[PDB]
Structure 1
Amino acid sequence: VINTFDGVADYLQTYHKLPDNYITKSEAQALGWVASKGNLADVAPGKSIGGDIFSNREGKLPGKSGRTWREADINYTSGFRNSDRILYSSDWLIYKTTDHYQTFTKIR
């Protein structure tokens, strides 16, 4: 799997998409994922949550008309979800957070 910052940042840009290890929260839920049980590993082995819309409500990420943001979980392997996320825009700007969407730094 490609679940590393560099790994996913590189891929996004090569293919313009997430590696196939990602599944959205609503997809994850349909397989039996319960956030409270930390069971993702069980129900969707080798999968990580990603591809959902990052609303960017706090205005922390560069805004623009017709620029949509999205997120994906980084460094996840099992149990409860961590605090690393990659944020990629529709014009393929990539940012990272390691604190829960509190701080963002440019990676690509």
Structure 2
Amino acid sequence: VINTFDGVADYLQTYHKLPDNYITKSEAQALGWVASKGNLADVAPGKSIGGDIFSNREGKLPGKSGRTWREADINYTSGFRNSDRILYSSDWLIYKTTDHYQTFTKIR
């Protein structure tokens, strides 16, 4: 299962899409994911949330015309989601956060 910062960052930049273990918030919800129950690994075994558009309303990540940002959970295996996310742009810039979107650092 590819869910580490280096593994997913290297997959995105080579394959230009997330690996097969990622499903969106909406897709997980439809499968029965209930965030306050921390049951993602029960209803969608082996999957992590990812692929959703990240608004970047706050302007923390660098903006550019035509640039859209998406997010994916990293280091997830079971229980409640954690605070680790990879942020990737349509032009393939890659950032990480480990503090639940408070701060980001570039990783590619």
- Cα distance between partner residues in 2 of 1:33 and 1:62: 32
Shift of 1:66: 1.0
Structure 1 length normalisation: TM-score?
0.99
> What RMSD over aligned residues (CA atoms) do the two structures have, in Å?
0.4
- Cα distance between partner residues in 2 of 1:91 and 1:50: 17
- Cα distance between partner residues in 2 of 1:35 and 1:99: 18
- Please state whether the residue corresponding to 1:92 is helix, strand or coil: coil
TM-superposition CA deviations, 1:22-47 (whole Å, max 9, x none): 00000001101100110101110000
- Please state whether the residue corresponding to 1:100 is helix, strand or coil: coil
* Identity over aligned pairs, percent: 100
- Cα distance between partner residues in 2 of 1:11 and 1:32: 28
Aligned length: 108
- Cα distance between partner residues in 1 of 2:41 and 2:75: 13
Gaps of 5+ in 1: none
- Please state whether the residue corresponding to 2:86 is helix, strand or coil: strand
- Please state whether the residue corresponding to 2:96 is helix, strand or coil: strand
Instruction: Please identify runs of 4+ aligned residues in structure 1 that moved more than 6 A.
Output: none
Shift of 1:11: 0.2
Structure 2 length normalisation: TM-score?
0.99
Shift of 1:74: 0.3
- Cα distance between partner residues in 2 of 1:29 and 1:23: 10
